[PDB]
Amino acid sequence: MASRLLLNNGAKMPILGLGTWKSPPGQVTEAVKVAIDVGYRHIDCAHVYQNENEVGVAIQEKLREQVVKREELFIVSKLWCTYHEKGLVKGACQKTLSDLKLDYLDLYLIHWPTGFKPGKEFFPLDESGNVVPSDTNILDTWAAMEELVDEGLVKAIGISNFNHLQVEMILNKPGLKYKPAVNQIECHPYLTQEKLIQYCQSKGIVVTAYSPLGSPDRPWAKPEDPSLLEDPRIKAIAAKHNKTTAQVLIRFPMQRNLVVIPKSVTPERIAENFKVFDFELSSQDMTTLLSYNRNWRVCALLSCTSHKDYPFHEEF
Ligand SMILES: NC(=O)c1ccc[n+]([C@@H]2O[C@H](COP(=O)([O-])OP(=O)(O)OC[C@H]3O[C@@H](n4cnc5c(N)ncnc54)[C@H](OP(=O)(O)O)[C@@H]3O)[C@@H](O)[C@H]2O)c1
Ligand SMILES: Cc1ccc(C(=O)c2ccc(CC(=O)O)n2C)cc1
């Protein structure tokens, strides 16, 4: 299978990338160095992860050492919710660039459709605990992203956690300049996303699947939660192919024409997660994995459920 797919800005995106959410700042530099050494060309980052400086240290070292060329890397980041105001977008992007030590991003995503009140707090709360919204709508934030493209700061722009109506809102924006190149959404056998994926792909929007392993390190994990990596049905499929369960879970979205971004700080797993290009899941395997859908979410953005733009009320 090809290592990259074509986006609608004319650029190629590596279908496998390294996730950084929850990667401790003390381990993430090594994690990214190892990833690049073992063949990863695509790194998924966010300002809200508060690790971008350390990730940047890794990228910069690998560039300086000429292990890789900048043009061979695909570096993605995301605009946090407290930055949706038009006057804050450029600055947010520039802070991310400075931390990553880059002069451009290959892809910059609106992290969530929900804008929040600007300030130091990433999740500003009222006295009663609800998130305080921004009055900036998704379409104006989109115009600000487009400006980032026209200023040379980012090669492509996209969205994340947009439901199909919100994607539709962007595609229908009056005077729309650039279409979203990507929608990055949670996807795995317990949330299969057939509808949203089909819609985006029908529009020429590439989908990136996050939490492909079910995010076993998520802070809110509970024992009664389903566990992909421990699912004996999935372990049986892996066993049949002489691969690991994680490898199956990574190959799964690839064969759906999705980009996938498993996260690890463990060097051995970083390497293991990358050799997915040497085997194929059967159509039967694929349909079987799809049959496991429970509509179960790792990231439900639970503090935002009353936000006018909360993505997950809608079926898809
Ligand atoms: N746009 C968004 O809103 C959004 C939301 C969530 C995630 N994301 C992106 O998607 C990335 C991946 O999602 P995620 O971090 O939620 O979780 P994930 O990639 O599904 O799972 C990461 C967890 O799996 C473990 N793991 C990795 N490889 C393994 C293997 N081969 N065998 C066993 N365990 C393995 C990791 O452990 P170690 O790290 O200890 O090895 C870590 O605890 C994130 O890092 C982030 O970049 C984006
Ligand atoms: C209670 C609470 C509130 C907010 C967070 C939080 O900041 C959060 C939730 C999901 C994610 C991953 C992503 O959006 O990429 N983050 C970074 C976590 C926990």
The secondary structure of the chain as a DSSP string is: --SEEE-TTS-EEESB-EE-TT--HHHHHHHHHHHHHTT--EEE--GGGT-HHHHHHHHHHHHHTTSS-GGG-EEEEEE-GGG-SHHHHHHHHHHHHHHHT-S-BSEEEES-S--B--SS-SS-B-TTSPBPBPS--HHHHHHHHHHHHHTTSBS-EEEES--HHHHHHHHT-TT--S--SEEEEE-BTTB--HHHHHHHHHTTPEEEEESTT--TT-TT--TTS--STT-HHHHHHHHHTTS-HHHHHHHHHHTTT-EE--B---HHHHHHHH--TT----HHHHHHHHTT-----S---GGGTTSTT-TTSS--
Angstrom CA distances, 272 to 2, 263, 269, 282, stand at 18, 12, 5, 21
**283: CA distance to ligand 2 center in Å?**
35
Q: From the alpha carbon of 20, which atom of ligand 1 is closest?
A: 45
- Of the CA atoms within 13 Å of residue 299, those in its CB half-sphere come to 21
Q: Name the catalytic one among 40, 49, 108, 190.
A: 49
Residue type present at position 167: V
Q: Where are the domains of the chain?
A: 1-316
- Bridge-based pairing of strands 4-6 and 12-14 is antiparallel
Quote the CA–CA distance of 210 and 184 in Å, as a whole number.
7
Based on C-alpha coordinates, what's the Rg of the chain? Answer: 19
Residue with tokens 């959410």: 21
The CATH fold of domain 1-316:
TIM Barrel (3.20.20)
Question: With a 6 A CB cut-off, is 114 part of the ligand 1 pocket?
Answer: no
Task: Return the number of other C-beta atoms located less than 10 Å from residue 279's C-beta.
Answer: 13
**215: CA distance to ligand 1 center in Å?**
5
Partners of 191 in the β-ladder: 188
**172: CA distance to ligand 1 center in Å?**
33
Is 219 known as a binding-site position?
A: yes
Question: With a 6 A CB cut-off, is 17 part of the ligand 1 pocket?
Answer: no
Quote the CA–CA distance of 211 and 188 in Å, as a whole number.
7
**135: CA distance to ligand 1 center in Å?**
32
111 alpha carbon, closest ligand: 1
Of all protein residues, whose CA lies closest to atom 11 belonging to ligand 2?
Answer: 299
Give burial (CB, 10 Å; 0-12/13-18/19+) of 269.
middle
List the Cα angle 124/139/306 in 5-degree steps: 40
Experimental approach taken? X-ray
* Residue among 4, 182, 203 at smallest CA distance from 108: 182
Q: Give the sign of the dihedral formed by CA 261, CA 266, CA 272, CA 275.
A: positive
Angstrom CA distances, 200 to 59, 87, 206, 302, stand at 31, 29, 7, 24
* Residue among 10, 30, 41, 6 at smallest CA distance from 277: 41
Q: Give the sign of the dihedral formed by CA 314, CA 198, CA 45, CA 71.
A: negative
Tokens of 38: 């073992």
- For the question of residue 199 being annotated catalytic, the response is no
Quote the CA–CA distance of 35 and 50 in Å, as a whole number.
19
